[PDB]
């Protein structure tokens, strides 16, 4: 592409609205995977282990005996946020996978 | 260059005034009591060298710097006319008591756009001291119950007094003048609606019976005549106050039925 269209192409991806159904692009650049982890909207597991119970509102995981302290090993509650009013009046939700 | 400031050009003229001596000021007050045009004029310049230092202390108020100097002069004129030569007191010692009262007399009348009497300003300055004192010992945001507790005042009274200090900011400082609207109706569609509605009322009162129309035109004054009460309209058409009230309900129902079949709904009028 040209340098003029690359400047305008970088603005179309900035002012994008999240749709109802999310579909991964067939063609990517490789940076689409490392850009979602650094953002604060994705839930990243801190302590690895076995998922005891999962729900649409919260995700509870059981911490293994290796990477845990002496007391209160399996204490980790991940509360997923529901639709809240964003700064640009757009819905924000998290879905378990 | 040199700017002809009102404060610099005034203070330069003060240096050309001799000092006031306690021995001669007593003799000058004796000549002013008998009556002399030059005695009161000369003695006015003696106490004038003190107005530049008294007004310089008060700052950060509603009045400008030049207003404190002119107001302080009016205090010594009312103080030099009343002096006791037999008491032996100093003339300047009595002048400093009137200029301080005259400064505070004008600091509360020209500080706000709304003219306020002495009865309501004596409560705002006290609450201003109470709001500053209670905020120092507590070191937090003062509440409405805290002011009414220390001052021993009702909770409803301290709310109305604090609301009088409007302190309105600017308007053109951005605009605000373009965003504000008018409270009165100015829409062309609303003014045309009031025209068609008023013309239909005079048309409906004429299309009905002539007897049922003149009993309501004199009671409420819809046709433009003077309004009359039940006793005032009794001596006009019928002295029987009960008979003229029955026909009012009959004309009220006829005007209601003629409005429903006219294509206009009563519930749609208020909306």
């Amino acid at each position: 592409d040209d340098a003029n269209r690359a400047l305008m192409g970088s603005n179309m991806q900035r002012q994008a609205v999240p749709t109802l159904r999310a579909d991964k692009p067939l063609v990517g650049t490789g940076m689409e995977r490392n850009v979602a982890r650094d953002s604060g909207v994705c839930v990243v597991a801190r302590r690895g282990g076995v998922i005891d119970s999962v729900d649409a509102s919260r995700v509870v995981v059981r911490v293994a005996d290796d990477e845990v302290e002496t007391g209160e090993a399996g204490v980790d509650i991940y509360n997923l946020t529901k639709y809240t009013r964003s700064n640009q009046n757009t819905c924000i939700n998290q879905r378990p996978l | 260059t040199r700017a002809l400031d009102a404060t610099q050009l005034y203070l330069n003229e003060i240096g050309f005034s001799p000092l006031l001596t306690p021995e001669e000021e007593v003799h000058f007050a004796r000549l002013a009591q008998k009556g002399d045009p030059a005695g009161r004029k000369r003695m006015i310049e003696s106490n004038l060298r003190l107005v530049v230092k008294i007004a310089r202390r008060y700052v950060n108020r509603g009045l400008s710097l030049l207003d404190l100097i002119e107001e302080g002069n009016l205090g010594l004129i009312r103080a030099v006319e009343k002096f006791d030569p037999e008491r032996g007191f100093r003339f300047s010692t009595y002048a400093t008591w009137w200029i301080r009262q005259t400064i505070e007399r004008a600091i509360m009348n020209q500080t706000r756009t709304i003219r306020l009497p002495i009865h309501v300003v004596k409560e705002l300055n006290v609450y201003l001291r109470a709001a500053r004192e209670l905020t120092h010992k507590l070191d937090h945001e003062p509440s409405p119950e805290e002011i009414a507790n220390l001052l021993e005042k009702p909770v409803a009274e301290v709310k109305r007094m604090l609301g009088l200090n409007e302190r309105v900011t600017s308007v053109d400082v951005s605009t605000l003048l373009d965003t504000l609207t008018d409270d009165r109706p100015t829409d062309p569609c609303e003014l045309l609606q009031d025209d068609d509605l008023s013309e239909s009322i005079d048309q409906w009162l004429t299309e009905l019976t002539d007897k049922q129309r003149e009993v309501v035109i004199r009671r409420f004054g819809l046709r433009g005549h003077e309004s009359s009460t039940l006793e005032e309209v009794g001596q006009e058409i019928g002295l029987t106050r009960e008979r003229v009230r029955q026909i009012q309900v009959e004309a009220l129902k006829r005007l209601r039925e003629i409005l429903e079949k006219n294509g206009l709904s009563s519930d749609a009028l208020f909306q």
């Binding site: - | 009102a6 004029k41 009016l74 020209q110 756009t113 053109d172 504000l180 206009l264 749609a268 009028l269």
Partner: protein, 1339 residues
């Protein structure tokens, strides 16, 4: 009606007439109840009540007597709008002088009092004492006095000396200023004084005192004793949510001046001494200062606000400079905006409109149909029906909207085509549909652009949008005759594929009967779209107007070319269709259809092209694939061969053979030569890529590639953009201005590298940064050009002048650029056109030149025809329609009332968004050489060398016109060949620009006279006997004795007689400049015309805007004042002054030039005042006062067109010359006799005064004038109306000048009527102003 508004000072008796009461108390409202009280700023006794027909007590609230007054209080009953007209005034104890007469640089009080600006301020502040009415005293009125100085003055005088200090001392002098006697003192001493700074002060004294008395103004009206107050409705107190309210900044300024006035009103009987009576007056003088204007001297501040107080001077100006906020923008009703959307199923004379917008914009129109039909008698019942959106409302909504046109316009408008009326059609959606063909005029794409909408209401506006602003009327562009509704990119692509010819296709060689029978075979599938067939057509020729004939003819065309003829009407021939039908082919087709058939059939023809263009484009599979960008096999051969040559150059740089200063030029010249070699091999492969086979052996035809179709048709793309996709990009430019030595080898298809892509960013970011700045400069350029061409409206139909300008084709250069037929198209003729033979006439009078006369003049050999230009026709108050050319939008002549001044300024600012050797003479054509303005004597050898600096070589063709005209330098050797045919490329001159040739017409022995050795000449030779001559010395490096000596090599006969040249008694002599090398020694015979000595020798918007401002460049060219003898000044004096001495009349006056610039140091030559001496930029100021007005208009149009033709735009010459007429309206007077010496008067005002004064007994009352060129910024302020000068810039200086002068304004312009509210005098508003003046002239 009303007119003739006046501006003057207010009198104390007049202020008390507008006022209804006196205010003395700053209190205006109460805290107990939000109702005003008596004697306040918002009071009801002076101003109106707070509501309609109400009072303070509330006893009378009826509508029977609206004019009655209340008896309990002073507030009477009135309406609610009465608070905007009533006003009050304050009573001041001491008068205070205003600041308007002291804020401007020339103090209006000081010029009338003969005082300075600082001295008039020292008296008002009680800082110095002045004396008035001295009489028999030595003290003067202008002299100052102190406290001790005034006391000593009374001791020596004793009486007749009154010294007053303050504002009353200044007012006491204005009453006895004796203005009638003060003018006599300056007029009697006018011839006595002789100074430059005193004459200018004398002119301002007489021009202001004459206008002061002629206006009926009084001197005591400058200072005002009372101050009027603004009505309270302009500064209201509106409460908002929360119990709070708002107060304007003006209420605080009025409160400060009222309380200080009462403090002075109560200190009049307290026997105040002198110490305080002088300071309390300054407290009031500074309050009026803060009320009038802030930021200049006072700069008053308030609490909790860092910005200064908004005074009365800052509220009228506002933002956007001096222009008011109301003039720059005004909100209107019945408007809206939405996103555009292209619709192919819409007619040209209509557009789209959503149902949700048509119901809100036409809301009052729906209420008029429901009451007239009988469905809803009450307007309230009809309002509830339109909101519910029942099925009956949609019936009347489509009925009220059937022929009511609406307006559509984009947000930025640069020309008249931005606002075009359309017929709304109800659609379903939330977007406004637009026709695809009118998008070229709106300059808007379907990428998110929002357009406005407007709804006309009155019956006069509906007929206006159907006659002039309709979409079917403005087809031709206001700049050139080319239509703007030309088929766009998408429809042209569909038409280019239709008009094609294939070598082998299905259904070739068949014969069809008619166009209807040929179309039947294509839809059946037995005939291809482009195949060689033989059809019979039926066309009509319109060679004779009023008669149409039919004829049958069988031609050999294709199936696609025959289907296109079914779209064009029968009025046009068939030869306009057999072409390839590119983008430029259809642009010439609509322009030919507009001038043959008419307009009713052109709209139908332009609409049918969009339908047949889109229908045949959707059937085509035109798509851009990766295989379309073909790469030629010769690309790898040129790159590998160029890479091996650079390796040979860089290896020689390390050895020391080639330098770095020359290596940079060789690399950029090697890759550039390789850049064109790839482009020639790429286009040769793309044009002949498709190879078809028929009847055995294969053949070659034009390639049907998808990328080549978009370039050959010209619909979208250019030829340079192909070199970036399938070819090398080449060298790129650095932001600093240099070019990188190494180019980009790869292209967009093969992929760029990380470093090669970083180079292309330098040119891309610079391009994106310029498009953000041109929007501000082009918008600022069109505002200065339209503000000087508003009062120019065509009002006359017959002027009667016989002047004009000579028109000639663009003969400069190697070939012609602009023909004659494209320059005089639409311009009437000035004089009679003459044939090459005498006693012959072609055009009898000033007839309008049309397309019929263009071909009539092209067949003849006529090339120089004079036309009538807007710079001619000196009539006043507009420009006649005869001298003006034809209309640009309409094919007929310009009617009476069209504002040609606005359409001329917009045609220049419209294309602003798109705009950012000489050794020998080699002719490219052949013809007879004809020399003009060249004086060359014969040569004994036969070379015919001409040493004249004025001359031009022109070759004439067989018809007699000059095809090519070159420039001949001075000292060029050229052989004449008049009457002989010249071959192409033959050398005619062999001059050398490195050395300045010096020749002498005298033929004989030459001897140096006045040459001193060691001072003027130095015997310096070269090494190894390289040059053995006599080198002269410089003027600055010479000694003091040889500074005033000038060598002069006089030429005489060999026998000893003095030889002189004919024409002048002075004998011809050879020039000997400084640092000259004479090869021929003295005492030897020299031929005539031989070399005597050897002497060695931006662009864009800032360039086009520099010509209209008459800005002098940094380096101006030096010319001659009066023609005659040319010489050299004295070098010892320090100023080279070339003296002149003509043969007819000797002029002792001359000019001096500094020694900083060296040019034409030759001693002894002709003057040639018309010819330039110092090479460089030429200033337009010196050209007007030297040659005349015809060359200045010819120079401006020539230089302006060279800037617009570089980008590719074409602008007619009528709009460039229209602005030149307004800039040449001001003239200067040298010897008036009837007016001032140096003043600025109009040319039309001086011509009427000259002609009227000539009709007398003396016949010499008139005077002489001189034309002067002014810029666009200075010509805008030189107007009689103060409204046009206040809205442009600096409304403070123009508002004060109109006060002391008392000018009466006559509303007869365009910008003056848009602020008052009346109709404009241009357009359809001329008939309204014609009946107004007719009624006024009758009495």
């Amino acid at each position: 009606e009303f007119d003739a508004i006046r501006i003057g000072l207010a009198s104390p008796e007049m202020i008390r007439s507008w006022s209804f009461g006196e205010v003395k108390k700053p209190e205006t409202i109460n805290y107990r109840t939000f109702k005003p009280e008596r004697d306040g700023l918002f009071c009801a006794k002076i101003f109106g009540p707070v509501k309609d027909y109400e009072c303070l007590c509330g006893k009378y609230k009826r509508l029977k007597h609206r004019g009655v007054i209340c008896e309990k209080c002073g507030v009477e009953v009135a309406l609610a709008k009465v608070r905007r007209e009533r006003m009050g005034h304050i009573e001041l104890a001491s008068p205070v002088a205003h600041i308007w007469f002291l804020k401007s640089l020339p103090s209006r009080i000081g010029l009338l009092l003969d005082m300075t600006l600082r001295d008039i301020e020292r008296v008002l502040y009680f800082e110095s004492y002045v004396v008035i009415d001295p009489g028999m005293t030595t003290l003067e009125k202008g002299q100052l006095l102190n406290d001790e100085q005034y006391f000593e003055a009374l001791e020596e005088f004793g009486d007749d000396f009154d010294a007053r200090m303050g504002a009353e001392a200044v007012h006491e002098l204005l009453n006895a200023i004796d203005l009638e006697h003060e003018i006599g003192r300056l007029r009697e001493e006018i011839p006595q004084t002789n100074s430059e700074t005193k004459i200018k002060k004398l002119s301002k004294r007489l021009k202001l005192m004459e206008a002061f008395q002629g206006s009926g103004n009084k001197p005591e009206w400058m200072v005002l004793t009372v101050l009027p107050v603004l009505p309270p409705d302009l500064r209201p107190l509106v409460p908002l949510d929360g119990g709070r309210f708002a107060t304007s900044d003006l209420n605080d300024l009025y409160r400060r001046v009222i309380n200080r006035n009462n403090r002075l009103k109560r200190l009049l009987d307290l026997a105040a001494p002198d110490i305080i009576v002088r300071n309390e007056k300054r407290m009031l003088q500074e309050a009026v200062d803060a009320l009038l204007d802030n930021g200049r001297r006072g700069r008053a501040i308030t609490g909790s606000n860092k910005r200064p107080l908004k005074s009365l001077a800052d509220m009228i100006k506002g933002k956007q400079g001096r222009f008011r906020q109301n003039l720059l923008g005004k909100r209107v009703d019945y408007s809206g905006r939405s996103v555009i959307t292209v619709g192919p199923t819409l007619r040209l004379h209509q557009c789209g409109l959503p149902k949700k917008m048509a119901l809100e914009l036409f809301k009052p129109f729906i209420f008029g149909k429901l009451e007239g039909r009988g469905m809803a008698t009450t307007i309230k019942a009809a309002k509830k029906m339109v909101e519910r959106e029942l099925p009956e409302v949609w019936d009347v909504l489509a009925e009220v909207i059937r022929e009511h046109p609406v307006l559509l316009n984009r947000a930025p408008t640069l020309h008249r085509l931005g606002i075009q009326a359309f017929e709304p059609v109800l659609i379903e959606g939330k977007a406004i549909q637009l026709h695809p063909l009118v998008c070229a005029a709106y300059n808007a794409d379907f990428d998110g652009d929002q357009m406005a909408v407007h709804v006309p209401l009155t019956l006069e506006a509906q007929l206006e949008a159907r006659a002039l602003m309709m979409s079917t009327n403005n087809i031709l562009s206001p700049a050139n005759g080319e239509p703007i509704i030309v088929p766009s990119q998408d429809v042209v692509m569909g038409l280019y594929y239709m008009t094609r010819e294939a070598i082998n296709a299905k259904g070739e060689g068949m014969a069809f009967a008619d166009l209807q029978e040929v179309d039947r075979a294509y839809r059946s599938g037995q005939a291809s779209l482009h195949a060689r067939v033989k059809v019979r057509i039926n066309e009509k020729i319109k060679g004779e107007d009023g008669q149409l004939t039919a004829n049958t003819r069988i031609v050999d065309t294709t199936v696609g070319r025959a289907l296109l003829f079914q779209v064009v009407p029968a009025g046009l021939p068939f030869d306009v269709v057999n072409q390839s039908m590119k983008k430029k082919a259809i642009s010439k087709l609509i322009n030919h259809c507009y001038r043959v058939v008419g307009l009713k059939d052109t709209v139908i023809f332009a609409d049918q092209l969009m339908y047949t263009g889109f229908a045949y484009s959707t059937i085509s599979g035109v798509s851009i694939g990766v295989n379309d960008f073909v790469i030629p096999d010769e690309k790898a051969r040129i790159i590998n061969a160029a890479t091996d040559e650079v390796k040979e150059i860089e290896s020689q740089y390390a050895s020391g053979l080639v330098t770095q200063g020359e290596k940079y030029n060789k690399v950029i010249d090697l890759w550039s030569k390789a850049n064109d070699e790839v482009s020639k091999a790429m286009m040769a492969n793309l044009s002949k890529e498709k190879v078809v086979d028929r009847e055995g052996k294969e053949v070659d035809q034009e390639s049907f590639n998808s990328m080549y179709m978009m370039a050959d048709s010209g619909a979208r793309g250019s030829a340079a953009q192909i070199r970036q996709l399938a070819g090398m990009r080449g060298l790129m430019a650095k932001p600093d201005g240099s070019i990188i030595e190494t180019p980009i080898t790869a292209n967009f298809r093969e992929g760029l590298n990380v470093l090669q892509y970083f180079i292309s960013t330098h040119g891309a970011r610079k391009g994106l940064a310029d498009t953000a700045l041109k929007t501000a400069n082009s918008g600022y350029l069109t505002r200065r050009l339209v503000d000087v061409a508003q009062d120019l409206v065509v009002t006359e139909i017959d002027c009667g002048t016989e002047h004009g300008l000579l028109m000639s084709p663009h003969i400069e250069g190697g070939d012609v650029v602009e023909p004659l037929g494209e320059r005089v198209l639409g311009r009437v003729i000035a004089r009679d056109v003459f044939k090459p033979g005498s006693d012959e006439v072609i055009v009898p009078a000033g007839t309008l030149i049309d397309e019929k006369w263009v071909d009539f003049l092209e067949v003849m050999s006529v090339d120089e025809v004079v036309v009538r230009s807007p710079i001619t026709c000196e009539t006043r108050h507009g420009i006649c329609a005869m001298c003006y050319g034809r209309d640009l939008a309409r094919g007929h002549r310009v009617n009476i009332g069209e504002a040609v001044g606005v359409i001329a300024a917009q045609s220049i600012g419209e294309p602003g968004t798109q705009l950012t050797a000489a050794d020998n003479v080699q002719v490219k054509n052949g013809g007879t050489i004809r020399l003009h303005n060249l004086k060359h004597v014969v040569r004994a050898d036969g070379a015919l060398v001409a040493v004249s600096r004025s001359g031009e070589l022109a070759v004439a063709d067989d018809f007699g016109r000059e095809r090519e005209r070159y420039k001949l330098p001075y000292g060029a050797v050229i052989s004449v060949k008049e009457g002989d045919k010249v071959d192409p490329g033959a050398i005619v001159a062999k001059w050398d620009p490195h050395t300045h040739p010096i020749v002498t017409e005298v033929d004989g022995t030459v001897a140096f006279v006045g040459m001193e050795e060691g001072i003027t000449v130095k015997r310096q030779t070269d090494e190894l006997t390289g040059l053995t001559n006599i080198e002269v010395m410089d003027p600055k490096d010479r000694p003091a004795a040889g500074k005033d000596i000038r060598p002069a090599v006089k030429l005489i006969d060999a026998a000893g007689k003095d030889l002189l040249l004919p024409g002048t008694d002075v004998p011809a002599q050879y020039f000997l400049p400084a640092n000259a090398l004479v090869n021929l020694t003295d005492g030897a015979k020299v031929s005539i015309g031989d070399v005597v000595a050897r002497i060695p020798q931006t662009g864009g918007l800032p360039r086009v805007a520099d010509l209209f401002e008459a800005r002098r460049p940094k380096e101006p060219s030096i010319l001659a004042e009066i023609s005659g003898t040319i010489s050299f000044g004295k070098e010892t004096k320090g100023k080279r002054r070339l003296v002149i001495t003509p043969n007819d009349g000797s002029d002792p006056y001359e000019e001096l030039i500094p020694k900083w610039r060296h040019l034409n140091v030759f001693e002894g030559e002709q003057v040639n005042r018309g010819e330039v001496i110092s090479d460089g930029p030429s200033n337009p100021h010196d050209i007007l006062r030297l040659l005349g007005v015809s060359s200045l208009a010819k120079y401006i149009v020539n230089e302006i067109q060279d800037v617009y033709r570089l980008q590719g735009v074409k602008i007619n010459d009528k709009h460039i010359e229209t602005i030149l007429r307004q800039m040449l309206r001001k003239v200067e007077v040298s010897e008036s006799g009837d007016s001032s010496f140096i003043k600025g008067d109009q040319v039309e005002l001086t011509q009427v005064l000259e002609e009227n004064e000539q009709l007398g007994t003396e016949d010499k009352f008139p005077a002489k004038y001189e034309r002067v060129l002014l810029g666009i910024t200075k010509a805008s302020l030189s107007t009689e109306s103060f409204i046009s000068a206040a809205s442009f810039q600096e409304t403070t200086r123009v508002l004060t000048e109109a006060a002391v002068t008392g000018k009466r304004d006559f509303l007869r312009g365009l910008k003056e009527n848009v602020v008052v509210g009346r109709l404009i005098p241009a357009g359809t508003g001329l008939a309204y102003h014609s009946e107004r003046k007719r009624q006024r002239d009758l009495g």
